[PDB]
Design a protein around this ligand. Structure first.
Ligand SMILES: O=N[O-]
Ligand SMILES: O=N[O-]
Ligand SMILES: O=N[O-]
Ligand SMILES: [Cu+2]
Ligand SMILES: [Cu+2]
Ligand SMILES: [Cu+2]
Ligand SMILES: [Cu+2]
Ligand SMILES: [Cu+2]
Ligand SMILES: [Cu+2]
Lengths: 333, 333, 333
């Protein structure tokens, strides 16, 4: 009887950060209430000023990470304000039935809906918009995010022993297909609807023009680098709603990796690089052992360094010369 | 001594259906006899009437699924009628030696051959045509299928316990590279040989024009949807002879997944999406828990909804409001 | 205290061969000393005479395979002779900190450096050049290789039992992006620097012009086929620093496969084809059971047979008619 379960409302936070939560569940099953507002908005995605009409959950690309525990009920209030122009909905890969909820959550501008589903399988899952007849357009305009369903007793390693993270970050990776003129310059449009016919032709080339973390080239660099300290245990959740990616921590590893993101499976150990298939969320666990700057990249290095799929970690702490040292610094022969 | 083993002839059925078989072997090892006839034929692959010269095993794209048990002998009679125009052969990824049998089964039009091999490894495997110097042309013209080698005691879960399916379907996914004129219209040809020079240039772009299930856009939709009922256990075998795919059941999961298709390995649990590498067959096991329409897609959603890699399941039964319910139906604010 | 550990200098050998080593460690941890010399050189990569300016470690594409054991120290002396024209460095995916060593090993022409790192995780790992601002250019010009970190007690199967190989081969797979004129002919350049601006535009198409084993179309065919005998146990190490690949032994299998290359994980059994993500090294173990010619391919068959990713094994021994036999040789009906 759901009417008698505890309820908690959770306010979401913008990626790459994650709303507060417990790793090991301290309560029994609950109804966890979320609210998301759809926002169509102009987004500048690179240094040259290329702009697109993004379709977002809660104003960000990716949408925010939701965190619940196995056999909680997720109750999502989805709002499509009348300032938007398109029909939207939501499909949870975590949910069972009605096309992940997409068949029940179709909202025109000016409408809202509330969906409830039981989170019966633990793991990280993609959620995304999927309206009849324009599914890839909405997904590749940034309308996707992820939900994490933790086991009620938290994460465990390949031997059943507890894994506790000190920090969690959510990296949503987005392939964009910006239409081009004949010389190769990017086009701009006044409304999403104006872009639609060109967007379909741009998608059919299967060649992204940009592949970005957190909605823009360089979004997770500089002042916006992810932070940690030597000795801290970090969980990196990574989603790609449409296209394969192969994350890699330059200078580190994935100590424990759920490449396809499902926690009833044992993790893969000591990964240098792992494949997250398009339409999947994965998670990697790493304990930092050296300070300094790390890059976190899609290890198709063209996609990383030419098309935008690269971010930074800045890690504080003491350098360990046993793990690595420069014996002879670069010098002339 | 093979001369003293029992023999059974099996008549194949057209995909997505699968010929009758036992999951748990009731006999000892047998010689299982199959006959396949090669057919080159014109195929209409989309709604706009695009036609190609398909090269098929037994008249279908994909070729039919063969089912045997571990350490059976597969005896294939391969017939190339004199109405065809090209040399053909067959390479079983399930077989050991002679390029999977391709070096022993080269038949010109008007010829036949009989190959026997021992099915020493359990799993689902690709088979495909592979003639010297024109391997990708034949494969990407649809000349590929799959063979399933069940363990003699049937499928088992990650804990060694029996898994029994009530229904099995075979989805063969095909990337096509149809040559285009300079405006982007598809070309048509009178014979396969006329197409050859353009086909090689179309393949070298590495960009498919169509990606389809069961040989055509929409082949597994509408009246041809796959069917099941709530409570039924379904095994979906999926093959891709040439290109990576990432299947996903919209509204469901892969409860047990052998993404690279080899049954001596434990399955991956609770997958939302899984990667089947080009040149591989995989299998997913799911128990339907909600009725309604499901879509089964390659979760590069451009490949699914723009290029053709999408099919339907229609599932009967009672809706379970505990798993999912619309609390507030879409309404105006 | 490193000053008191034994030291051994190892001279590297050209791929596909591997320098002599012990599978089970016979000594305690050691400092293993390697020397590599960078060589920028013109390379002919196909039958039509297409030439590129390769950037190599030790004069080969890929760079040589280094073999050490877990918790050895790797001490690399890296030399950039003054006959080269570009800055180079090295990033070991096996190493922890300083961008895998890339931040510590930047050498201009005429400089050298010596890096030491502890090999704390067993597996096969990529190493590659990665200079600030031109990472994919150097990697896709061939400046990548692999290092194998064996467990001190050797390789083990999925049940913990010893796996011993008789032969080991290293196949480095390289995607090249050769710039083209408007008719599609490949361009040639006098120096690497002349090529740079066109190379970036060629890479951004994400479409390789060539995909080769051991630096050239046909490099591992003919007289340069890999060799083995029936009954021999062969380990094939395969790396791809930039792009996914899906290796397949035509006529064989991967009996034990570490597709993402990390030996603390149990191997996948009986693979027909396996996915090595871009930026990863994998390893497959196979016992040959039939003599004859085998092809070893990337099983995107367009990439294999049109773009160059195919090599040969020639295996001696006695044919086993129990595994495969031609019952009726190809004959006219
Ligand atoms: O080592 N990451 O390119
Ligand atoms: O949720 N399948 O797009
Ligand atoms: O069976 N390898 O194409
Ligand atoms: Cu939408
Ligand atoms: Cu989806
Ligand atoms: Cu054929
Ligand atoms: Cu094959
Ligand atoms: Cu370099
Ligand atoms: Cu790297």
């Amino acid at each position: 009887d759901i009417s008698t379960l505890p309820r908690v409302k959770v306010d979401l936070v913008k990626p790459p950060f994650v709303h507060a939560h417990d790793q090991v569940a301290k309560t029994g099953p609950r109804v966890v209430e979320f609210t998301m507002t759809i926002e169509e908005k102009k987004l500048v995605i690179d240094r040259e000023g290329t702009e697109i009409h993004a379709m977002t959950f809660n104003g960000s690309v990716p949408g925010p990470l939701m965190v619940v525990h196995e056999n909680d009920y997720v109750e999502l209030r989805l709002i499509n304000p009348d300032t938007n122009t398109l029909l939207h909905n939501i499909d949870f890969h975590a949910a069972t039935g009605a096309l992940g909820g997409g068949a029940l959550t179709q909202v025109n501008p000016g409408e809202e809906t509330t969906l409830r589903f039981k989170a019966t399988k633990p793991g990280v899952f993609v959620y995304h918009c999927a309206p009849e007849g324009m599914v890839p357009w909405h997904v590749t305009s940034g309308m996707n995010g992820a939900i994490m369903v933790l086991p009620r007793d938290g994460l465990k390693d390949e031997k059943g022993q507890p894994l506790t993270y000190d920090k969690i970050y959510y990296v949503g990776e987005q392939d964009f297909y910006v239409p081009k003129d004949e010389a190769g310059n990017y086009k701009k449009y006044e409304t999403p609807g104006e872009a639609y016919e060109d967007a379909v032709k741009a998608m059919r080339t299967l060649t992204p023009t940009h592949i970005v973390f957190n909605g823009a080239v360089g979004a997770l660099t500089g002042d916006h680098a992810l932070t940690a300290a030597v000795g801290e245990r970090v969980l990196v959740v990574h989603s790609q709603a449409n296209r394969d990616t192969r994350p890699h921590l330059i200078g580190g590893h994935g100590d424990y990796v759920w490449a396809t993101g499902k926690f009833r499976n044992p993790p893969d150990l000591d990964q240098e690089t792992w494949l997250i298939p398009g339409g999947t969320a994965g998670a990697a666990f790493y304990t930092f052992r050296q300070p300094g700057v790390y890059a976190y990249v899609n290890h198709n290095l063209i996609e990383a360094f030419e098309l935008g799929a690269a971010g930074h970690f800045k890690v504080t702490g003491e350098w360990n010369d046993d793990l690595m040292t420069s014996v002879v610094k670069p010098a002339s022969m």
